[PDB]
Symmetry: C3
Subunit: 119 residues, 3 copies
């Protein structure tokens, strides 16, 4: 996809073609550009409370951000491009999937909890 809606529908996150995630309002106004990844961004997600955005990148990281664009964490450990990211329904854990078929589970404080499959 490369697009995610905030739970309240008021903010939309999109993976851009220039290594950023863009946040937009419902009227299609650009609100914020999230800069930090060092190659293409593939996947985006919002937390269930709507206050954190996750991004998944070809740079082999997942980054966590707030709505003001501040980088909160960089989740490092995948050995290939990360294409997918999702938050758990209670918002406390994050799953990430890389194109080498590895899935990792993290806490939001950035701790790797488990590699569910792969390396």
């Amino acid at each position: 996809w490369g697009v995610a809606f905030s739970p309240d529908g008021q903010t939309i996150a999109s993976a851009s073609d220039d290594k950023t995630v863009k946040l937009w309002n419902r009227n299609g106004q650009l609100l914020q550009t999230l800069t930090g990844h060092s190659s293409s961004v593939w996947g985006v997600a919002f937390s269930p409370d709507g206050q954190t955005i996750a991004s998944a990148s070809d740079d082999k990281t997942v980054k966590l951000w707030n709505r003001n664009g501040q980088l909160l964490q960089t989740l490092t450990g995948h050995s290939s491009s990360v294409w997918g990211v999702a938050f758990s329904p209670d918002g406390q854990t994050i799953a990430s999937a890389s194109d080498d078929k590895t899935v990792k589970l993290w806490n939001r404080n950035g701790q790797l909890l488990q590699t569910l499959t792969g390396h």
Copy 2:
């Protein structure tokens, strides 16, 4: 996927192999065939209230329908096949994704609001 459940689980929408979307009840009985696309349908989605269906087609359009099968709107602007379509959680916006890596955001009345990436 090419399948979507209504939020109440009572209607199922499927992209068929014949340029249509089919609507089925929970017992697998056919309710409606949505006819109008001029080539393959790839993606389907329901609105959160369950009363509108969106379809994404190789004909480069997204169409919006009601449950009685009536065509409400055609969203034109993608320059390639549209594979994905999704409503926002509040139902007020619609994102569409084409295989040329373009994502467009529309309002619920079919107004194009923004091209989030691509052309």
Copy 3:
């Protein structure tokens, strides 16, 4: 994906590389290994009540399991590898999708309701 969170976020199901589904707690600790498929597991899903897990396999079946690891049902009928499985939001139907573009709809007692497309 190959991963699904239970609706309450307390159990995580993942397709493993060894023909099993693994269930994990929120801390990443293994709870169960679901053994029975005779080749790779591709897709997993939870019922909306969180009490049943579905798995979709290269062995052309979907298996239904409980959180104690007991196999409850095997859904047979697809003539190719099953990659996707999903429960309806009310939990009364299951859709399965195989890589020959067939989608089947089943009830919760394992009755095939309809082949929505394909064979």
